[PDB]
Every structure is written in C-alpha cells, then in structure tokens.
Design a protein around this nucleic acid. Structure first.
Lengths: 211, 490
DNA sequence: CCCGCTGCCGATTCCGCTGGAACATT
DNA sequence: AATGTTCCAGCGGAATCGGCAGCGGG
C-alpha cells in the first residue's frame, strides 16, 4: 500500500561550505533531494514526505529541551508531496549557519514518525540523512535509539558528500574525493555512523551508504 | 535489386499422358500439377503477394496467346496472385475438372516446345516491372517431345539457350509416370521429384531485405564508419484490417479532425497545446516543445568503450537484438575498420559498448555490440553472417526487483530422477517450424473466406505438447518422483 | 538576354518498424 | 487496477523521376 519517507538533510555551515573548486555539498544534496521529490511528485504515487532540516537558523522543532534539539526545523510533516514541497527546496538558498548535530535530527525523525503514524496505515517507514559529518556528535542516547529503530521496524539511509577517504565534478563512475576530502572530525563521524549502522543490521547497512 | 519482384510461369503438359492415371486410382499427373499450382498460389498470396505468377497450357487443341501459335493456351498472363485466379484453376481439380479442361480447350495435339518457350519469353517481356528472377516451372512427364523430329529438338534447344541468356532459368519437375523417379531424362542441357515441399512447405512467411537504419558509428571524435542496423528477427503480426463499406465492399476513406471550441469550427494544428494535470495544477506546453524535451544526441552509435562478453549477464534482455553490419557507400573505407574491430574483438572476446540513437529526436539508449563470427562449411551453411549483434541494455528501472525472500533447496537425489526425465525428453530444439497458431489460423480462415470453399482448415499447432507421448515415454518414474518424500498427507 | 542540354537532387510512393495512446479483460 | 492486444501516428529506406540550377553555345 502506502509508504512514508522522512528526509533529514543538513543545512549547516560546514556542509554548505564554500566550493573547494568542484561543487558544494549543500548543492549536491539539494540536487539529490529535489530529484527524489521530483520522481515522487510526477510519479503520482501514494507516498508521504516529511522533510526536516538540521543545522538551521532557528529551531522550529516539535520538541526542543534546553540546549539539545537546536537548529532543527521540521519543515513538513508526512503529507502528499506537492509543488509547494518542491519549490521549497527550490526556494531554500539560506543555509542558516548554526551547525548543531545530526543524531538530533534522527531522533526528531522517529518522533515525527510516531507523532504522525495515526489514522494512516503504513507498511514502510524510511528516514534519509544528508550530512557532511562535521559537527560534534551527540552521545546523549545511542542504545535506546537503536532499540527504537529495531522495535519500530524502520530502515534508514545515510548519504555523505564526496569525502570517502581526476576533476571529479558530479558523477563520472570514478573517484569521490579529488585529493583529500575528509577531516578527522569527518573521519570519526564516518566511523561512528558505520558502527551504528552495522550494529543496526550489519553489512547491508554498510552497503546502504552512498555519496 | 530491392524492388525486384519475382516471376514464375507455370508450363504444364496436356498432351495425352496426364489424363490417364497409369492404370491406378491414385491421381492423374495433370491433377497433380494443378494441385501443385494451387499450393503455390495459396502460398505466395500470403508470402510474396507482389510476385507475378502465370499459368500456360500447351499441347491443347484451341489456342490463345499474343502471337497466335497453335496449341498454346495462356490461362493467365503473369500478374499478382488473387482469389479469382485460384478459383479459376480450382475449377480443373479432380476428374470433373479434368473433363471441364477437356471441354474448354481440349488436350491432344502436336505442340512444338519451341513456340511455347517463345510464348513464355513474350510473357516475361511484356511486363513493366523490375524482375529479380525469371523462372519457368515445366510440369511434364514426357521425355521426347521430339520423338519423330530432330529439327524440332534443335529449335527447342536453341530457344532454350535463347531464354537462358536473357536470364530466364527453366527448371523441370517431372510428374513420375510410374510414380517413382527412374525415368532419367537426358535434358540436363536445357534445364539448370522435389515436389512435396512445393505441395506444402511454407504455410506462411514474408520476404524483404532492408537497412532499417543507416547510422554512423563514431570513434568519439571524428573516426566515423557508416554502418547499417539490420533486423534479423522481427515478430511478424497479422495485417491490419481495412474499414470496408457494407453495401458495396469499398474502402471508406476515413478522415479525423478536431473542432468545436464550444462553437463548431475546425481547429488547425496550431491553435492547440499539450497539457498534463499533475496533482492540482496543469502544466501546458506546445507540440514542438513536447517533441524536443526528448533530444540528447544525433542519430548514430558512439563507443563508450569495451567490455568482455563475460560480465554482461545474458538475462538482461528487453528488446530483440539488432545486427550491425558495415556500410561503405556513405563513408568509404568503413568496412576495413569494421573487419579489424570484428577480428580483434573476437580474438579478445570483448564486445563494444555504444550509446545508440536510431532516430533524430529520441533519447539515447545503451547497447552492446557483441561480435559474432560467420559460420559456414562445405555444404555452405550460411546461417549467421559476420558482424555485430546489438544487445539492448536495460537502464535501472527497466529492471524490477522481486520478493526474493524465499530460499529452500532440494536433496541431491531428486536431481538424479529429474535428470533421468530430462535426458529422456532431450530433443534438438529446431531449425524452424513452430509457426504461430494465431497467425496460421488467421491465414487459413482468410483463405476459406476468400475462396468460400467448404469451411476453414484447422492449423495443426506445432506449439502444443504431445502430452500422451511424454506420458508414455516416461512411463513409471514421474509417480516415483511425486511421492518420494512428500505425500499429500491429507 | 537567349537557348539548350545534363547532371543531380529533391520529393513522392511504397513499405516497414516503432512508439504512443486506447482498448478490454480478472 | 495490471496487462496484453489493437490501433493510430510518425520516421526512414529505397527506388523513381522530374525539374531546378548552372553551364556552355548561339
């Protein structure tokens, strides 16, 4: 029957950094998400899109307890993707330079899924992440969120910019980072997300990570 | 030549010896010839309904032809086959048709065998079409039309060579006088039985040979070789119906138009646009716009590189393969590069990968030019030509993902008995002969409707399984398979 | 400016294939 | 509603052929 996808995409300053000489990860992630919503809208399929932005100017979050849950705005709830949801991405030049976290966006995504799994039957729950993995990771709770993922029976997918380890422009069946695109903060971010995803369901999760 | 229609004149013998059945009640050879010509008409009226066919009778009493020789009767001047002519010959079937033949023109006379060849030549020479092959089938059983004259024989040989030089090839199938080929005629000079095929070999087929595309295989900057993209296998389908007027059986000349912008008035192709209503909002753009948003490259093939034949796994099929073959007349020297690529790719077992674009405004689509080696023998088994095979490659969504959540193996002992069964049923696939039941039945029903004879034949479906044959040829081992580990258990 | 050939090149007709749109069914 | 069939529409190959230019002579 139906499906529900809850996109979370970064707008933080480091992810929206200036072009090193190829592109900007914000633009690449924006292109990918606009392609996804484009296919969804013009395919006229009965699926819901809930878009949230982490690392924003303000925090228009359903829950914001003190310092945590900050710079995150749930722009759209699970609703039929219309041309408004597409012009939104087309009219979202602002990055909102306050890089806070990404796991906060994840727990907000589960929160909104449980908040909107009412009155609408759903067989699949998917959440997408777009992150440079450049902010300080939060370890407020990791085991319980994994248990929540296991019990809610949802599958996530994480996308990261060119940094994985010729003039690579957008996609050419070749290299991802031109010379050296990763930092130690991004290195440990990739490490922690890899180990989290492996602990979730293992090597298949390591397969479900794409630039 | 491409537009060269084939020609065939039927020259049957009506002198004395085909109106008696050699003291048998099987079939008079004249009737055998009429059966053969009926078969050829009904075959080429749906196989090659552009070729010209003619029926000419010699040795008859009265005469008809453009020269007015005696004892030569042209029943039909050569032209395309039709139902009228098949019926006109059908009125001479059997003994009743035999006596009908007797009374309309009448057998028994001194034919010349040099005036009749001249009449055949005139028939061939009086048509205004490009002919690919002129051929004359001589239906006769007699050996010596010259039994009492040698001048007649010399004139016949002269006129036979005189036919041959103008590209008219005479071939002779002899109606066996005793019913078996032991009458060995010495006329290997005149001619250039094999007849059961001519009674029924090809129930339905077609004829052609054409490019279907003339493209440029470009080596990505300027090295362009012209090349034809032929269609080796096509999936023919029944001809389209014709709207026909009830009261007179005439084509009705349809005409479609759009009008009435709530007023009543013709709309030209310029005052309309094309729209798609998505969600709530309607997107509008004009016809040339909706033709041009699918436009990536110019027509032709462009190499994306090379991949060995191994890693393109041969269940990625969605569109029947085509056949690349070099065409030099567009750009000269293409065949040299084509041969070099063919040889090198065959020796390396590597197929080229191209971006195919057949027509001017059509999205590019990825193809693999898999080399194929021409095979041939002393018998001249030309069953695959040299060149490339375009395997069309799926993109990402032409593929579909399936449940896949099922994995259960069987013990390595049912495999043995299935092996028993399969080696029991092992058979050579075919060279031909699985003709479409729907298409063949359509042709047979149409034959019946046009000739309104008795009622339509039932095409024997070669596609059906010989169920009793399998059941008997396996015997008592399929039941052994059914109940070895898994009874119904009720 | 005429006058005349004469290459030749454009368009038609005839096929045939493909694609897109409409149909009818469980 | 998922699909296969039918139908309609459009593009191209191939052959033909006529006249449109341009090019010499008058």
């Amino acid at each position: 029957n139906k499906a529900a996808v809850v996109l979370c995409m970064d707008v933080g300053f480091t992810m929206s950094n200036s072009i090193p000489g190829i592109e900007s990860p914000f633009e690449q992630a924006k292109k990918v998400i606009t392609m996804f919503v484009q296919r969804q809208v013009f395919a006229e399929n009965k699926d819901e899109i809930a878009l949230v932005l982490f690392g924003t100017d303000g925090t228009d979050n359903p829950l914001s307890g003190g310092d945590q849950y900050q710079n995150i705005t749930v722009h759209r709830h699970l609703m039929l993707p219309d041309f408004d949801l597409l012009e939104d991405i087309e009219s979202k030049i602002q990055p909102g330079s306050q890089q806070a976290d990404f796991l906060d966006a994840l727990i907000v995504s589960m929160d909104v899924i449980q908040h909107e799994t009412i009155g609408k039957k759903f067989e699949k729950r998917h959440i997408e992440i777009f992150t440079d993995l450049s902010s300080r990771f939060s370890k407020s709770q990791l085991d319980i969120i994994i248990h929540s993922l296991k019990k809610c029976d949802i599958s996530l997918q994480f996308f990261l910019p060119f940094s994985l380890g010729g003039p690579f422009r957008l996609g050419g069946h070749g290299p991802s980072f031109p010379l050296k695109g990763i930092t130690e903060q991004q290195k440990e971010g990739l490490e922690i997300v890899k180990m989290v995803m492996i602990s979730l369901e293992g090597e298949d999760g390591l397969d479900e990570i794409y630039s | 030549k491409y537009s060269g229609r084939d020609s065939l004149i039927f020259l049957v013998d009506a002198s004395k010896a085909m109106f008696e059945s050699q003291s048998e009640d099987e079939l008079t050879p004249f009737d055998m010839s009429i059966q053969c010509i009926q078969s050829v008409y009904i075959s080429k009226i749906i196989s090659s309904d552009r070729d010209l066919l003619a029926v000419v009778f010699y040795g008859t009493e009265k005469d008809k032809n453009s020269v007015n020789f005696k004892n030569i009767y042209v029943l039909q001047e050569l032209d395309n086959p039709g139902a009228k002519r098949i019926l006109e010959l059908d009125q001479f079937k059997g003994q009743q048709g035999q006596k009908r033949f007797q009374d309309m023109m009448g057998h028994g006379s001194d034919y010349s065998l040099s005036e009749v060849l001249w009449v055949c030549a005139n028939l061939f020479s009086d048509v205004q079409f490009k002919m690919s092959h002129k051929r004359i089938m001589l239906f006769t059983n007699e050996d010596n039309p010259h039994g009492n004259d040698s001048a007649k024989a010399s004139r016949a040989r002269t006129k036979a060579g005189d036919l041959r030089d103008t590209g008219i090839f005479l071939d002779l199938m002899h109606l066996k006088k005793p019913g078996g080929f032991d009458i060995s005629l010495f006329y290997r000079d005149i001619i250039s039985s094999k007849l059961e095929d001519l009674l029924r070999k090809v129930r339905a087929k077609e004829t052609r040979k054409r490019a279907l595309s003339r493209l440029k295989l470009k080596l990505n900057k300027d090295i362009v070789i012209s090349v034809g993209i032929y269609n080796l296998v096509q999936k023919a389908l029944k001809p389209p119906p014709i709207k026909l007027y009830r009261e007179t059986n005439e084509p009705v000349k349809t005409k479609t138009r759009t009008f009435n912008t709530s007023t009543g008035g013709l709309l030209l192709p310029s005052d309309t646009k094309r729209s798609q209503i998505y969600g709530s909002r309607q997107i509008i753009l004009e016809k040339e716009e909706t033709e041009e948003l699918k436009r990536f490259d110019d027509p032709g093939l462009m190499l994306m590189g090379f991949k060995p034949l191994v890693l393109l796994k041969k269940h990625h099929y969605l569109r029947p393969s085509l056949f690349v073959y070099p065409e030099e007349s567009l750009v000269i020297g293409s065949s040299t590069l084509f041969s070099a690529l063919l040889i090198k790719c065959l020796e390396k077992e590597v197929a080229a990968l191209c971006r195919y674009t057949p027509r001017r405004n059509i999205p590019p689509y990825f193809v693999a030019l898999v080399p194929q080696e021409e095979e041939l023998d002393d018998q001249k088994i030309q069953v695959t030509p040299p060149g490339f095979q375009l395997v069309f490659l799926p993109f990402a969504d032409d593929k579909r993902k399936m449940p896949f959540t099922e994995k259960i193996m069987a013990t390595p002992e049912q495999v043995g008995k299935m092996k028993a069964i399969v080696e029991k049923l092992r058979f050579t696939y075919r060279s031909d002969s699985f003709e479409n039941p729907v298409l063949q039945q359509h042709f047979r029903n149409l034959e019946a409707l046009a000739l309104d004879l008795m009622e339509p034949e039932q095409a024997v479906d070669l596609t059906l399984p010989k169920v009793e044959a399998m059941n008997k040829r396996l015997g008592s081992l399929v039941d052994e398979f059914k109940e070895l580990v898994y009874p119904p258990d009720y």
